[PDB]
Amino acid sequence: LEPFYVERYSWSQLKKLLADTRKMAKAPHDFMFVKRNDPDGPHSDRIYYLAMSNRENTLFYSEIPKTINRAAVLMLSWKPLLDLFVGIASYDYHQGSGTFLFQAGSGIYHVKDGGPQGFTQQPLRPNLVETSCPNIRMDPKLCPADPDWIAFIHSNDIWISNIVTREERRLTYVHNELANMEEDARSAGVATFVLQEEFDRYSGYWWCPKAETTPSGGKILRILYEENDESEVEIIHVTDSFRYPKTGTANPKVTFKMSEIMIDAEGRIIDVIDKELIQPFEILFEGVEYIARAGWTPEGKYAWSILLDRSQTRLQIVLISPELFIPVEDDVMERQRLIESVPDSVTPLIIYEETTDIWINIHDIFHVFPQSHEEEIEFIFASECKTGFRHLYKITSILKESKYKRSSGGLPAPSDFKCPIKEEIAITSGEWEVLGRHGSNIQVDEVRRLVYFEGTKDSPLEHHLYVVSYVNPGEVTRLTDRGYSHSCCISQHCDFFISKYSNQKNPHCVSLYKLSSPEDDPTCKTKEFWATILDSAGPLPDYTPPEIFSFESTTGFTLYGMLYKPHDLQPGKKYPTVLFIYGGPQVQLVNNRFKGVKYFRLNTLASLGYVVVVIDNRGSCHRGLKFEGAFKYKMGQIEIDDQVEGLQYLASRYDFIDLDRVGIHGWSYGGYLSLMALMQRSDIFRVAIAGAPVTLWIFYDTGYTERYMGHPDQNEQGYYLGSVAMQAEKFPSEPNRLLLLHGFLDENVHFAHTSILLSFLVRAGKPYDLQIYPQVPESGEHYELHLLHYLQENLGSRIAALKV
Amino acid sequence: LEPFYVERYSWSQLKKLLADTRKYHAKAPHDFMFVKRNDPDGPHSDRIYYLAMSNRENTLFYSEIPKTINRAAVLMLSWKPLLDLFQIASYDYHQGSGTFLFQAGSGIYHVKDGGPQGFTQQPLRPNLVETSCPNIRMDPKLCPADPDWIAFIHSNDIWISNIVTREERRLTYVHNELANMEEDARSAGVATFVLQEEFDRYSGYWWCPKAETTPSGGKILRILYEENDESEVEIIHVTDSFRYPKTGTANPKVTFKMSEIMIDAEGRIIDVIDKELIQPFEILFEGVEYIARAGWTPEGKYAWSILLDRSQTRLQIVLISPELFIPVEDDVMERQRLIESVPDSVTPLIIYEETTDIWINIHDIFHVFPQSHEEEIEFIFASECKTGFRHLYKITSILKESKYKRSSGGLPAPSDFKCPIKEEIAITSGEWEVLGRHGSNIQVDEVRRLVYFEGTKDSPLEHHLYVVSYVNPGEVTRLTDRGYSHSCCISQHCDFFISKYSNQKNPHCVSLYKLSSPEDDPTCKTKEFWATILDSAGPLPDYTPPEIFSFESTTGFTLYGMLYKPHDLQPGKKYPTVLFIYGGPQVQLVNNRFKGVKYFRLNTLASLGYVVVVIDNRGSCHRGLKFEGAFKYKMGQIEIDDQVEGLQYLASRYDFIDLDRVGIHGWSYGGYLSLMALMQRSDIFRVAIAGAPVTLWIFYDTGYTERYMGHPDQNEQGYYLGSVAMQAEKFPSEPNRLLLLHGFLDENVHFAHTSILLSFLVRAGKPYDLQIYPQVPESGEHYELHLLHYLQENLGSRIAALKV
Ligand SMILES: *C(=O)C(CC)(CC)C(=O)Nc1cccc(CN2CCN(Cc3ccc(Br)cc3)CC2)c1
Ligand SMILES: *C(=O)C(CC)(CC)C(=O)Nc1cccc(CN2CCN(Cc3ccc(Br)cc3)CC2)c1
| Nearest alpha carbon to residue A594 among A480, A508, A690 | A508
CB pairs under 8 A between A and B: 75
- For residue B386, how many other CB atoms are within 10 A of its CB? 14
| Nearest alpha carbon to residue A743 among A699, A790, A778, A691 | A691
- For residue B276, how many other CB atoms are within 10 A of its CB? 19
Helix axes A600-608, A777-791, angle to 10 degrees: 30
CA A150 vs CA A81, A101, A105, A140, A263: distances in Å: 21, 8, 17, 7, 14
Shortest distance between the Cα of A703 and any Cα of chain B, in A, equals: 25
**Which residues of chain B make contact with A779, given a CB cutoff of 8 A?**
762
Say whether A734 and B758 touch across the interface (CB within 8 A).
no
Helix axes B669-680, B639-653, angle to 10 degrees: 70
Shortest distance between the Cα of A11 and any Cα of chain B, in A, equals: 6
| Residue A438 burial (10 A CB sphere; 0-12, 13-18, 19+) | exposed
CB proximity list for A109: less than 8 A, separation 6 or greater: A101, A102, A103, A126, A127, A128, A129
Decide if B662 contacts B684 (C-beta within 8 A): yes
- The radius of gyration of chain A from alpha carbons, rounded to an integer in Å, stands at 29
**Can you tell me the distance from the alpha carbon of A224 to that of A201, in angstroms, rounded to the nearest whole number?**
15
Decide if A198 contacts A359 (C-beta within 8 A): no
Decide if B657 contacts B651 (C-beta within 8 A): yes
> Which sign, positive or negative, has the C-alpha torsion B653, B657, B661, B664?
negative
CB proximity list for B318: less than 8 A, separation 6 or greater: B285, B304, B305, B307, B348, B349, B350, B351, B417
| Nearest alpha carbon to residue A200 among A586, A635, A499 | A586
**Which residues of chain A make contact with B773, given a CB cutoff of 8 A?**
762
> Which sign, positive or negative, has the C-alpha torsion B744, B746, B750, B753?
negative
- 3 state DSSP class of A362: coil
CB proximity list for B717: less than 8 A, separation 6 or greater: none
Task: Please name the member of A734, A758, A782 whose beta carbon is closest to the beta carbon of B765.
Answer: A782
What's the CATH class of domain A29-534?
mainly beta
Decide if B131 contacts B110 (C-beta within 8 A): no
Atom of ligand 2 nearest to the CA of B693: 7
Decide if B373 contacts B303 (C-beta within 8 A): no
Ligand 2 contact via B789 beta carbon (within 6 Å)? no
Q: Which residue of B has its CA nearest to A9?
A: B734
CB proximity list for B305: less than 8 A, separation 6 or greater: B256, B291, B292, B293, B294, B317, B318, B320
* Mutation pick for ligand 2 pocket among B667, B749, B776 (CB with most ligand atoms within 8 Å): B667
| Residue B335 burial (10 A CB sphere; 0-12, 13-18, 19+) | middle
Pairing of strands B685-691, B738-743: parallel
Say which amino acid occupies B347.
T
Residue B692 DSSP symbol: S
A697 in the Ramachandran plot: left (φ > 0), alpha (ψ -120 to 50) or beta?
alpha
Taking the centre of ligand 1 as the mean of its atom positions, its distance from the CA of residue A667, in whole angstroms, is: 5
Instruction: Say yes or no: B789 contacts chain A, CB-CB below 8 A.
Output: yes
| Nearest alpha carbon to residue A311 among A254, A358, A273, A354 | A358
Q: Whose CA is nearest to atom 15 of ligand 1?
A: A667
Residue A483 DSSP symbol: T
Taking the centre of ligand 2 as the mean of its atom positions, its distance from the CA of residue A646, in whole angstroms, is: 48
Shortest distance between the Cα of A782 and any Cα of chain B, in A, equals: 6
**Can you tell me the distance from the alpha carbon of A453 to that of A445, in angstroms, rounded to the nearest whole number?**
11
**Can you tell me the distance from the alpha carbon of A589 to that of B401, in angstroms, rounded to the nearest whole number?**
88
B746 is catalytic: yes
Alpha-helical regions (H) of A360-431: none
Q: Whose CA is nearest to atom 25 of ligand 2?
A: B601
The CA-based diameter of chain A, rounded to the nearest angstrom, is: 92
- 3 state DSSP class of A728: helix
**Can you tell me the distance from the alpha carbon of B381 to that of B390, in angstroms, rounded to the nearest whole number?**
10
Say whether A765 and B799 touch across the interface (CB within 8 A).
no
| Nearest alpha carbon to residue A486 among A439, A454, A527 | A454
**Can you tell me the distance from the alpha carbon of A22 to that of A600, in angstroms, rounded to the nearest whole number?**
9
A639 in the Ramachandran plot: left (φ > 0), alpha (ψ -120 to 50) or beta?
alpha
CA B331 vs CA B81, B327, B335, B340, B343: distances in Å: 56, 11, 6, 15, 21
Task: Please name the member of A11, A755, A770 whose beta carbon is closest to the beta carbon of B770.
Answer: A770
| Nearest alpha carbon to residue A781 among B331, B310, B764, B664 | B764
Ligand 1 contact via A589 beta carbon (within 6 Å)? no
Say which amino acid occupies B20.
D
The 3-class secondary structure across A431-454, one letter per residue, is CCCEECCCCCCCEEECCCCEEEEE
Task: Please name the member of A733, A769, A785 whose beta carbon is closest to the beta carbon of B12.
Answer: A733
Which among B762, B788, B791, B792 is the top mutation candidate for probing chain A, defined by the most A β-carbons within 10 Å of its own β-carbon? B762
Classify domain B30-534 at the CATH topology level.
Methanol Dehydrogenase; Chain A (2.140.10)
Task: Please name the member of A11, A765, A770 whose beta carbon is closest to the beta carbon of B782.
Answer: A765
Pairing of strands B391-398, B421-426: antiparallel
| Nearest alpha carbon to residue B444 among B420, B416, B467 | B467
What b/e readout covers B526-549, taking b as 16+ CB neighbours within 10 angstroms?
ebeebbebbeeeeebeebbbbeeb
Method: X-ray
**What is the per-residue DSSP string for A51-102?**
EE----EEEEEEEEESS--TTS-PBPP-EESB--------EEEETTTTEEEE
| Nearest alpha carbon to residue B664 among B635, B650, B646, B643 | B643
**Can you tell me the distance from the alpha carbon of B785 to that of B13, in angstroms, rounded to the nearest whole number?**
10
Phi, psi at residue B283, to the nearest 5°? -75, -50
**Can you tell me the distance from the alpha carbon of A224 to that of A256, in angstroms, rounded to the nearest whole number?**
7
The 3-class secondary structure across A763-783, one letter per residue, is HHCCCCEEEEECCCHHHHHHH
**Which residues of chain B make contact with A775, given a CB cutoff of 8 A?**
759
- 3 state DSSP class of A110: strand
